[PDB]
Enzyme design. Structure first.
Site, PDB file in Angstrom:
ATOM      1  N   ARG A 158      29.184 -52.461  12.947  1.00  7.91           N
ATOM      2  CA  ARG A 158      29.402 -52.156  11.528  1.00  7.91           C
ATOM      3  C   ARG A 158      28.341 -52.791  10.630  1.00  7.91           C
ATOM      4  NH1 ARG A 158      34.467 -49.908  13.396  1.00  7.91           N
ATOM      5  NH2 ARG A 158      33.067 -49.451  15.160  1.00  7.91           N
ATOM      6  N   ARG A 204      33.265 -59.615  11.248  1.00  4.26           N
ATOM      7  CA  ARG A 204      33.682 -59.802   9.853  1.00  4.26           C
ATOM      8  C   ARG A 204      35.136 -60.264   9.704  1.00  4.26           C
ATOM      9  NH1 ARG A 204      33.520 -55.040  11.332  1.00  4.26           N
ATOM     10  NH2 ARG A 204      35.357 -53.666  11.255  1.00  4.26           N
ATOM     11  N   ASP A 230      42.169 -49.995   4.576  1.00  5.54           N
ATOM     12  CA  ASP A 230      40.864 -49.417   4.833  1.00  5.54           C
ATOM     13  C   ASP A 230      40.891 -47.879   4.824  1.00  5.54           C
ATOM     14  OD1 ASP A 230      41.998 -48.648   7.279  1.00  5.54           O
ATOM     15  OD2 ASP A 230      40.405 -49.535   8.508  1.00  5.54           O
ATOM     16  N   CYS A 257      29.186 -21.224   6.388  1.00  6.76           N
ATOM     17  CA  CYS A 257      28.030 -20.524   6.920  1.00  6.76           C
ATOM     18  C   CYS A 257      26.907 -21.454   7.303  1.00  6.76           C
ATOM     19  CB  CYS A 257      27.534 -19.484   5.931  1.00  6.76           C
ATOM     20  SG  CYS A 257      28.722 -18.155   5.695  1.00  6.76           S
ATOM     21  N   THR A 258      26.783 -22.583   6.609  1.00  8.54           N
ATOM     22  CA  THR A 258      25.751 -23.563   6.945  1.00  8.54           C
ATOM     23  C   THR A 258      26.071 -24.224   8.271  1.00  8.54           C
ATOM     24  OG1 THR A 258      24.891 -24.002   4.730  1.00  8.54           O
ATOM     25  CG2 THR A 258      24.684 -25.771   6.336  1.00  8.54           C
ATOM     26  N   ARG A 271      28.115 -22.853  10.571  1.00  8.45           N
ATOM     27  CA  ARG A 271      28.181 -21.812  11.578  1.00  8.45           C
ATOM     28  C   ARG A 271      26.815 -21.334  12.046  1.00  8.45           C
ATOM     29  NH1 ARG A 271      32.804 -19.244   9.867  1.00  8.45           N
ATOM     30  NH2 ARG A 271      31.533 -17.972   8.421  1.00  8.45           N
ATOM     31  N   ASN A 294      26.675 -15.897   3.482  1.00 10.73           N
ATOM     32  CA  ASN A 294      27.292 -16.762   2.470  1.00 10.73           C
ATOM     33  C   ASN A 294      28.801 -16.738   2.600  1.00 10.73           C
ATOM     34  OD1 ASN A 294      24.590 -16.680   1.303  1.00 10.73           O
ATOM     35  ND2 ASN A 294      25.231 -14.705   0.429  1.00 10.73           N
ATOM     36  N   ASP A 295      29.452 -17.804   2.136  1.00 12.50           N
ATOM     37  CA  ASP A 295      30.915 -17.889   2.132  1.00 12.50           C
ATOM     38  C   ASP A 295      31.531 -16.827   1.217  1.00 12.50           C
ATOM     39  OD1 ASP A 295      31.630 -21.404   2.797  1.00 12.50           O
ATOM     40  OD2 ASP A 295      29.793 -20.277   3.217  1.00 12.50           O
TER      41      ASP A 295
END
Ligand code: PRO
Lengths: 1001, 76
Positions: free
Chosen positions: A10, A470, A533, A589-590, A592, A767-768
């Site tokens: 981390r 931590r 968290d 679409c990006t 896919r 495009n969507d």
């Protein structure tokens, strides 16, 4: 072994690899090991420097335990250094921890890279040590703490180089155009996010070839979507393509010595509401050193009037001699300087934690050149933490030592106040990083000690290895044990006054645990503290606190960034009153078809993994066991069924079959599917203008040729085979061993890889916003559940932190193969693990600081503060460094029938399980409200539009029974309270917002 | 007049403002410069969080004054 990733995981996402390589070679010396010194030391040892050396020959006294969590009553009379060394040495096996016995020598001293002078070192001696460091090229940091006040001073020498001022990912973006005069226009809509004077390099700019050199260009910002880099006429003419990447460049900075800075200081402000105080405290802190010299090393005495007057005279004399320091005409702030005198002996856990977290981070900055150092002076105070004098009068009697580890806290707050802290009943929800720091603060506070108080901590998590870095109450030997139990144990070791006083529970806090955390539980508590968290759980608790009217302390961190928030009943907005920015949504679409970032290919790899080895198995087992699964699916349809027939007629018989499967999947996803996309949209297709279809965010991909020696091709098949083995319960050939390359090779070398046949009718969307997103054949070619009785597929439960389970192996390889497809730089498995597993960077440094600020806000709750302007919401970025505060926002106020009410905290209370008709009447004869609507959770109980059938069946019922009816099956059982929501029309007939209802059973 | 907005990421935005301008207003100038919807913008100045309904002069903002754009962080 350069950087153990299982320990520094981390922290490694906060600092770089490179910066930790630089830390791993630094020696640190801390001078003085009281509260402040041991905080700094804890945080620095946890981070992992080359070595920690420690100097404090002073004998342990009782009062030191006020903030020194590593001392005990037994240690009294021993040297502080000797006693802490062993405890610090247990924090990080990689960091040796030594004690230095004297300071007269040079040969030791000159070996250290950073020297930290603490509250135990006088200003005279500070000036001398800094002088030796400055002229030696040794980084120097000092810090002192005095009641609710503190300062830090940084001198990093004449020459220091910052390698990265912010720690932020470099900006990146797609180029649409570069004009001859060097103006770079962004691709329609994409923001560059650059700032004047940033530097940038270029890729893939076809036409200006030598521009892609690696050469950097100074950036002049034109607007959000465009920036200039000066003439490029001499590189050629822009044609197409282009990616900019911001590059951080070394900056050399110069620091002044302490001696110089004392008379001409450079400030960083801790609180902009308090800027006029820095100059004042700068003079103040010098004055209490002039005081000590004059009074044989002694500070002014607690709440002493004479000593305060003396201090005011000392500060006054300073300003007469230097009118520049406060400013021409500016008066000495006597009430501030008075308070500094009054509190000079005070040792406050909240203040120490804050300065420890922040000084420790400066140390790390000084080792690595990573982040921007604090340019020289910072002053802090938290005077708003003082109780109201009329209830906890602060004077010489009230405030005197009574022979107790708490008497430097009594020094500031008075006995009665300190006693009220002990008598608090608190709930700590979570026992991770903030939990450990919190419990620790509480131990030092004595919080919950004393007959009427106590602490409850819950956390269902066990201790993981990646957490030790931590969560400093845990040891390597504790891994696998429960977080809250180990932390309570560890904290009683620090302060025995908490034995039998901390109830360590191991339950989650949500809908499913309401029996254990009932009204009786919540009603008892004074206040609640979040150490969580995630947001869902923060929201659950926030809901409970408003129902039960309990104060809530909130805090969170991400890397060097941190925040703090106070929720006060009938006073402030709550946690939920506010929403943070959502996770940025990636277009379907990006993901896919058109990835252009490694984030895109990870997301795709992660859903593919879930497809292959989670949802496949689940669906099959649902199909096999449930009677009406198929029809229910009809009422996300075609793919569901296909998953159940592939998965049932493609059954592997041995591990060999799993290798074949994975290798064939490789050909599907990285070769055949790519070739179909290129068939669908040929490489040369041109949209409007003459612009290529494959430009901007659409990178034309290239199909893969399987190559076993390629790390990503190989691991996709290995991970793939093993996980498929796992679905089908087949003994893997890797299960025992390292993947055998020659085995996988012999199998794959003998396979027919069928070639690609394109589909002329299948259309992929661009495009969507575009339309559009054989059935019975798939249905009764499912081979009857009867043919497969007693057969199950074993679903995979994504576990990111188990390096042997093939999960991250798969996601990394699968993402990188698709990244290879679309010419994206491939990522290593640690970077994939970060993104796919949504891991949050954390460091002890920001955690202490944030817990410190919470505890300074805690005092205000103890005084039941009514004035909103006393409370501070905190915001922090240690990278810059930046600290800021805002007064909380007031709870929204509503109005109905000229009657004011608190929209968050106000409610109608109703005794007994009242009939529905009585409810409505009570609201007419007492509040001028007719009920439009009555609901319990998501269930509708009553509405004025209901027919006379439903009306008279329900009007007569008690709320209990009314809920039994509407809920197909409901009977409460252990519930003593019910929340009801209401819609009502007012005395004039119009619709009004109205408090909720609580029915007391 | 000029004011400065500093992000937690350490980016500085110059803004062109009037003393009368609303907080709603300042925020849409941020949205123009930076893309962050007003809904997610949390502004603080001189110890106070700037609330939609009010104006700049209300919070005593001057020329060369610095505001800060802040954030709640999950995880601990
Ligand atoms: O006497 C005493 C403090 C000093 C000035 C105000 N009252």
């Amino acid at each position: 072994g350069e950087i153990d990733e299982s320990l520094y995981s981390r922290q490694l996402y906060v600092l770089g690899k490179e910066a930790m390589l630089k830390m791993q070679t630094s020696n640190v010396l801390i001078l003085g090991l009281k509260g402040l010194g041991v905080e700094i030391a804890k945080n620095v040892v946890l981070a992992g420097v080359k070595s920690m050396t420690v100097f404090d020959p002073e004998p342990v006294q009782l009062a030191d335990l006020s903030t020194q969590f590593f001392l005990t009553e037994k240690d009294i009379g021993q040297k502080r250094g000797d006693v802490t060394r062993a405890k610090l040495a247990e924090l990080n096996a990689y960091v040796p921890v030594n004690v230095l016995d004297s300071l007269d020598d040079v040969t030791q001293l000159s070996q250290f890279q950073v020297v930290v002078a603490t509250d135990t070192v006088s200003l005279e001696d500070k000036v001398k040590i800094n002088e030796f460091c400055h002229s030696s090229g040794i980084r120097f940091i000092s810090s002192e703490t005095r009641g609710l006040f503190g300062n830090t001073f940084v001198d990093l020498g004449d020459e220091f180089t910052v390698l990265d001022p912010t720690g932020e990912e470099p900006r990146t973006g797609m180029v649409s155009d570069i004009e001859p005069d060097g103006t770079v226009t962004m691709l329609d809509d994409n923001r560059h996010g650059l700032e004047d004077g940033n530097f940038v390099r270029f890729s893939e700019v076809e036409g200006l070839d030598k521009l892609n050199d690696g050469t950097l260009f100074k950036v002049e910002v034109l607007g959000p979507f465009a920036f200039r880099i000066g003439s490029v006429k001499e590189y050629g003419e822009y044609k197409k393509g282009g990616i900019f990447t911001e590059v951080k460049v070394p900056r050399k900075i110069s620091f002044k010595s302490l001696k110089q800075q004392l008379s001409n200081p450079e400030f960083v402000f801790s609180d902009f509401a308090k800027f006029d105080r820095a100059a004042q405290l700068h003079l103040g802190f010098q004055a209490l050193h002039q005081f000590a010299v004059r009074h044989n090393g002694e500070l002014p005495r607690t709440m002493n009037d004479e000593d305060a007057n003396e201090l005011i005279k000392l500060v006054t004399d300073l300003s007469v001699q230097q009118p520049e320091v406060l400013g021409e005409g500016v008066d000495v702030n006597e009430d501030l300087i008075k308070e500094l005198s009054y509190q000079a002996r005070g040792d406050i856990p909240g203040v120490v934690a804050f300065f420890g977290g922040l000084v420790a981070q400066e140390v790390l900055k000084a080792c690595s050149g990573k982040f921007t150092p604090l340019k020289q002076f910072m002053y802090f105070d938290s005077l708003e933490s003082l109780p109201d004098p009329k209830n906890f009068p602060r004077n010489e009697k009230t405030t005197q030592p009574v022979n107790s580890r708490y008497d430097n806290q009594i020094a500031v707050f008075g006995l009665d106040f300190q006693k009220k802290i002990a008598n608090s009943k608190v709930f700590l929800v979570g026992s991770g990083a903030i939990g450990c720091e919190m419990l620790k603060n509480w131990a030092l506070l004595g919080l919950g000690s004393g007959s009427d108080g106590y602490i409850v901590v819950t956390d269902n998590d066990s201790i993981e290895k990646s957490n030790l870095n931590r969560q400093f109450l845990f040891r390597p030997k504790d891994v696998g044990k429960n977080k809250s139990e180990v932390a309570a144990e560890a904290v009683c070791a620090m302060n025995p006054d908490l034995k039998g006083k901390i109830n360590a529970k191991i339950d989650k806090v949500g809908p499913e645990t309401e029996e254990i955390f009932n009204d009786s539980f919540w009603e008892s508590l004074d206040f609640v503290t979040n150490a969580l968290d995630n947001v869902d759980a923060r929201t659950y608790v926030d809901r409970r606190c408003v129902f039960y009217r309990k104060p809530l302390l909130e805090s969170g961190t991400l890397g060097t960034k941190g925040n703090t928030q106070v929720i006060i009943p009938r006073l402030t907005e709550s946690y939920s009153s506010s929403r943070d920015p959502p996770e940025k949504s990636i277009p379907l679409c990006t993901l896919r078809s058109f990835p252009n970032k490694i984030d895109h290919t990870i997301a795709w790899a992660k859903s593919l993994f879930q497809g292959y080895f989670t949802d496949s198995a689940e669906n099959v087992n649902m199909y096999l066991t449930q009677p009406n699964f198929v029809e229910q699916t009809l009422k996300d349809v075609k793919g569901v069924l296909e998953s159940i027939s592939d998965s049932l007629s493609s059954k592997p018989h041995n591990f060999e079959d799993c290798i074949k499967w994975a290798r064939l999947e490789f050909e599907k996803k990285f070769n055949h599917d790519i070739k179909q996309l290129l068939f669908n949209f040929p490489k040369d297709a041109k949209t409007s203008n003459g612009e290529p279809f494959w430009s901007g965010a659409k990178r034309a991909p290239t199909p893969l040729e399987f190559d076993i020696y390629n790390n990503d091709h190989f691991h996709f098949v290995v991970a793939g085979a093993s996980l498929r083995a796992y679905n089908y319960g087949i003994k893997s050939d890797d299960s025992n061993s390292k993947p055998n390359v020659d085995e996988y090779k012999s199998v794959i070398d003998h396979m027919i890889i069928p070639e690609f046949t394109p589909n002329a009718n299948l259309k992929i969307q661009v495009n969507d916003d575009d339309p559009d997103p054989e059935i019975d054949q798939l249905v009764s070619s499912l081979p009857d559940p009867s043919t497969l009785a007693g057969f199950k597929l074993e679903p995979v439960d994504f576990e990111k932190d188990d390096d042997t389970n093939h999960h991250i192996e798969f996601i990394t390889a699968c993402s990188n193969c698709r990244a290879q497809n679309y010419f994206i730089e491939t990522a290593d498995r640690q970077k994939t693990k970060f993104i796919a597993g949504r891991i949050i960077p954390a460091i002890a440094t920001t955690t202490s600081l944030v817990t410190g600020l919470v505890n300074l806000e805690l005092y205000k709750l103890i005084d039941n503060k009514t004035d909103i302007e006393q409370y501070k919401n905190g915001f922090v970025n240690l990278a810059l460094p930046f600290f800021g505060f805002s007064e909380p926002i007031a709870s929204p106020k509503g109005e109905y029938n000229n009657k004011k009410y608190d929209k968050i905290w106000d409610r109608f209370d109703i005794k007994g399980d009242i009939k529905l008709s009585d409810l409505i009447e009570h609201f007419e004869k007492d509040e001028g409200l007719e009920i439009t609507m009555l609901s319990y959770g998501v269930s509708l109980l009553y509405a004025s539009f209901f027919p006379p059938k439903k009306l008279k069946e329900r009007l007569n019922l008690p709320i209990t029974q009314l809920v039994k009816l509407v809920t197909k099956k409901d009977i409460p059982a252990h519930v003593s309270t019910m929340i009801l929501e209401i819609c009502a029309d007012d005395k004039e007939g119009e619709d009004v917002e109205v408090p909720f209802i609580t029915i007391h059973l | 007049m000029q004011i400065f907005v500093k992000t937690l990421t350490g980016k500085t935005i110059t803004l062109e403002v009037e003393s009368s301008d609303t907080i709603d207003n300042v925020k849409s100038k941020i949205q123009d410069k930076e893309g962050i919807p007003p809904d997610q913008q949390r502004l603080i100045f001189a110890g106070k969080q700037l609330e939609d309904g009010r104006t700049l002069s209300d919070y005593n903002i001057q020329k060369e004054s610095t505001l800060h754009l802040v954030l709640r962080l999950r995880g601990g």
